[PDB]
């Protein structure tokens, strides 16, 4: 709900968690392809 707009400090806190989702998503794709290969194997 960014409709009202967030001040300086409010936006800083939001970045702390948003960056974890992008990094956590990087590990979701690697292992799934390493698992799918063993499955196929």
């Amino acid at each position: 709900s960014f409709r009202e707009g967030l001040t300086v400090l409010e936006y800083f806190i939001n970045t702390h968690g948003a960056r974890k989702g992008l990094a956590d998503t990087a590990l979701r794709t690697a292992d799934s392809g390493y698992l799918t290969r063993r499955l196929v194997d």
Binding site: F12, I13, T15
Partner: protein, 883 residues
């Protein structure tokens, strides 16, 4: 604002900018100037600092002496332009009883870059720890250069120690003991190959600006830290698996002598903002409580960060945490960090357009970012113009001095993007110092113009703008609004070889006079000639050994009386799928002394340019991370058009699903229409309650007015709807948009209107470097690698696609055994297979049975080399071999 020739861009800022944006190109200059120890640094540091500062090299000798002192630096050998032309390194030799020349010393341009072997490089500042966030040191360009010199000097003394013992005493001098090879080779080994030394990314002025200022985080660990406020931008980082590691410096970030980043802070005492702005490093930040930028200050005078936590000193302004690229996204406070990061990255992915239109709805950084990038011509001294020509501009300063500026005209950038400067001044114009004289590639009137302002409609249009696809009006092609020039460089060399010396000549062995029709007398394509895929650019010929020709060819030789020429053909043709006009030719000969690598006789390079119309398939995007390809381009006739008959330029589907939002995009679209049509609040008996927070200046505005809404301090929802209410009609006085920002559009095909009112407006979109012409690849047959006989992507083109392991799984899943076998054999590794297939295809015969893929044969050889006796046993044939 505060700049002489600054254009009029009204701002919705409710807070004054107390401190002017620092020279955001200083991070590179200060460090290198401290390194070389320029007098400007000594004069600047002595005024408010230690009276005995030591230069980087001066400090290196201080610790090294006694084993060297007073090093010299002559004026630069050649000019930057002269270095980039001759492919040499912008350097100034340095000197140091016996005098010693240590080597050519690279130098930093005014743009904070280096010319290393004719290419413009940029050193990235590294942030290393001196644990906690504040414990980060941050090596500046000059400092991490000095450290590389330490290795050179120290190992140089290791050589002198060995030399003096074996050498006779008094029979040796500093010149005989000093072998500076490890010193000069240490700096040459840095600017090249070093991971911190990088080719300047410059397809738009902003890209190169953010390339500098960008820093490395490591010398969990990727997550942002409270300390990063006002220092490193958390909203800017690569999307790939390098997030967090790489980050761009904040706008107002300033580095202290050591390298510890400092942030501007205005100490707040007694609840009143003090104009005294002081440097507070990460550690010094906890000492005094820091106040929030957006604060309620009533008239004259008048949520804070704790020393170690969250929620004494006041912030200098908003966007301290934000970087330049991030600070240029209007309505940044509404978009999610993901899209904001996406938006910033795509801003530096834009390409310079031929027209370069400034954004209709922008922020504040445009003007400052453009002039600081270095791609815009600035007047050094107030005065008046004496001459204005497409080639150069001269200014007659009142002082009496006489300065001139040569303009980059169709200069190819590092990735083929054309950089063309336009003069914006006239003859008698009186210009002030620091003013803008000529526009850069992506600039207009001094401010960055990375895209164009287009009429948008946010309605789904018969599935052609599906998911992330976009549809454009053919007007964008006819009016060259999204047309961008792209220059390509080709090169060929003539050197000595094993059995002969290459000779670049016009005469080609087997060719018709038509194919050579566009070549000159020397054999190089004539200037201004149109070149299609496969045409010859430079005719080179190299010696061929014992001919041993085929008899079937010799017979035709005598029949048609064409003497089998002596040597082979080696001409430089245009890569497949490329085309354009020839701009310039650079010829470097040997008879003409010049200076080429040993064996090279002649060196010529041809530059080809292309005028790229915005084509279906190209990738467009806005400043809010929204991106998508061009799915279709309708003629202007069949396009949703307003009652004026004014067709819309692009039709964008509603990408933002709920929760996903992407709110910032919707805001600038409405403001885009406001700024395009002007407004007038029609104040009667006061002004509406929403305009109370507004400053007078935005009350009345004419059509096509540019607006500025700085990131966090920008227009607000209430003020918007109010501006929506005020909209100057067109010719005849009809109204095209209501207070909801919607309009009843007429389907240009059926002729009947669309049943519901559709949202229309003007959005600032960009043309991204991803281009169809560069990404379309097709291959029937082509070159094959040497070691592995697999289809190799020829340097011209024709690279084959990879059928990876996963694709094989999908092929096995279908059970298409034949299609799979076909791909891994006759289509790749089958030495005799792919030829007999092509043969069979031309004749129209059945395709033969696949053979043995060369990869497998190589496998057995690799095994045998490992002393593994492998035998491909038959059912009853015992052993077998390939052969």
């Amino acid at each position: 604002n505060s700049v002489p020739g600054a254009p009029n861009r009204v701002s919705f800022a409710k807070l004054r900018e107390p401190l002017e944006v620092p020279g955001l190109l200083d991070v590179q200059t200060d460090s290198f100037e401290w390194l070389v120890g320029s007098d400007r640094w000594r004069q600047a540091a002595i005024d408010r600092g230690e009276e005995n500062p030591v230069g980087g090299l001066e400090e290196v000798l201080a610790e090294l002496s006694p084993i060297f002192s007073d090093p010299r630096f002559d004026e630069v050998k050649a000019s930057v332009d002269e270095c980039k032309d001759k492919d040499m390194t912008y350097a100034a030799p340095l000197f140091v009883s016996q005098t010693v020349f240590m080597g050519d010393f690279p130098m930093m341009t005014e743009k904070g870059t280096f010319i290393i072997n004719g290419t413009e490089r940029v050193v990235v500042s590294q942030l290393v720890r001196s644990d906690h966030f504040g414990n980060r040191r941050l090596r500046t360009v000059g400092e991490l250069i000095q450290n590389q010199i330490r290795v050179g000097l120290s190992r140089m003394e290791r050589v002198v120690r060995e030399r003096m013992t074996t050498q006779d005493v008094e029979a040796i001098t500093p010149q005989t003991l000093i072998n500076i090879r490890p010193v000069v080779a240490a700096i040459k080994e840095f600017f090249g190959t070093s991971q911190l030394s990088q080719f300047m990314d410059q397809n738009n002025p902003l890209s190169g600006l953010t390339h500098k200022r960008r820093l490395l985080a490591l010398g969990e660990v990727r997550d942002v830290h409270p300390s990063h406020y006002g220092r490193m931008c958390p909203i800017e980082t690569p999307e790939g698996p390098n997030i967090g590691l790489i980050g761009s410096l904040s706008v107002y970030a300033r580095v202290n002598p050591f390298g510890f980043i400092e942030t501007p802070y205005r100490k707040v005492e007694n609840g009143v903002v003090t104009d005294q702005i002081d440097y507070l490093t990460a550690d010094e930040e906890d000492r005094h409580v820091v106040a929030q930028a957006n604060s309620p200050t009533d008239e004259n005078g008048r949520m804070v960060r704790k020393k170690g936590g969250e929620v004494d000193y006041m912030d200098v302004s908003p966007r301290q945490m934000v970087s330049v690229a991030t600070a240029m996204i209007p309505f940044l406070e509404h978009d999610d960090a993901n899209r904001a990061l996406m938006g910033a990255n795509m801003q530096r992915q834009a390409v310079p357009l031929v027209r370069s239109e400034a954004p209709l709805v922008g922020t504040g950084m445009e003007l400052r970012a453009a002039i600081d990038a270095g791609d815009v011509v600035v007047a050094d001294k107030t005065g008046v113009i004496e001459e204005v020509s497409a080639d150069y501009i001269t200014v007659m300063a009142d002082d009496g001095t006489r300065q001139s500026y040569r303009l980059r005209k169709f200069a190819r950038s590092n990735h083929g993007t054309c950089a063309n400067q336009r003069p914006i001044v006239d003859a008698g114009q009186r210009v002030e110092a620091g003013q803008v004289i000529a526009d850069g590639p992506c600039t207009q009137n001094g401010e960055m113009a990375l895209g164009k302002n287009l009429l948008v409609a946010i309605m789904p249009w018969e599935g052609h703008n599906y998911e992330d696809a976009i549809i454009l009006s053919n007007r964008l092609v006819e009016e060259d609004v999204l047309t961008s020039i792209h220059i390509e460089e080709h090169e060929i060399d003539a050197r000595d070889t094993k059995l002969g010396a290459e000779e670049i000549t016009r005469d080609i062995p087997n060719v018709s006079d038509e194919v050579l029709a566009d070549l000159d007398e020397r054999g190089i394509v004539r200037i201004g000639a149109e070149v299609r895929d496969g045409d010859i650019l430079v005719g080179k010929v190299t010696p061929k050994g014992e001919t041993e020709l085929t008899p079937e060819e010799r017979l035709l030789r005598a029949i048609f009386g064409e003497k089998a020429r002596e040597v082979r053909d080696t001409s430089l043709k245009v890569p497949h799928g490329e085309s354009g006009k020839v701009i310039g030719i650079r010829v470097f000969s040997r008879e003409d002394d010049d200076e080429l690598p040993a064996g090279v006789n002649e060196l010529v390079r041809v530059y080809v340019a292309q005028k790229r119309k915005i084509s279906d398939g190209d990738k467009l995007a806005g400043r809010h991370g929204n991106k998508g390809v061009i799915g279709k381009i309708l003629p202007v006739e069949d396009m949703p058009f307003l009652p004026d008959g004014t067709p819309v330029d692009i039709i964008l589907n509603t990408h933002g699903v709920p929760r996903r939002m992407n709110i910032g995009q919707i805001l600038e679209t409405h403001l885009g229409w406001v700024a395009k049509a002007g407004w007038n609040i029609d104040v009667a008996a006061g002004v509406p309650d929403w305009a109370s927070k507004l400053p007078e200046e935005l009350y009345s505005a004419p059509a096509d007015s540019t607006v500025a809404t700085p990131v966090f301090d920008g227009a607000q929802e209430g003020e918007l709807a109010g501006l929506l209410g005020s909209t100057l009609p067109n010719r005849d006085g009809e109204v095209m948009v209501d207070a909801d920002g919607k309009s009843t559009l007429f389907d240009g095909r059926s002729g009947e209107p669309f049943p519901y009112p559709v949202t229309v407006g003007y959005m600032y979109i960009l043309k991204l470097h991803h281009l169809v012409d560069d990404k379309i690849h097709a291959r029937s047959t082509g070159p094959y690698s040497m070691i592995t006989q697999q289809p190799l992507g020829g340097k011209a083109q024709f690279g084959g696609q990879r059928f990876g392991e996963m694709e094989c799984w999908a092929m096995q899943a279908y059970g298409a055994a034949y299609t799979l076998q076909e791909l891994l054999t006759i289509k790749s590794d089958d030495t005799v297979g792919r030829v007999k297939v092509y043969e069979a295809i031309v004749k129209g015969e059945n395709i033969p049975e696949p053979g043995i893929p060369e990869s497998f044969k190589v496998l057995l050889k690799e095994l045998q080399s490992l002393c593994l006796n492998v035998e491909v046993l038959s059912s009853d044939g015992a052993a077998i071999e390939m052969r």
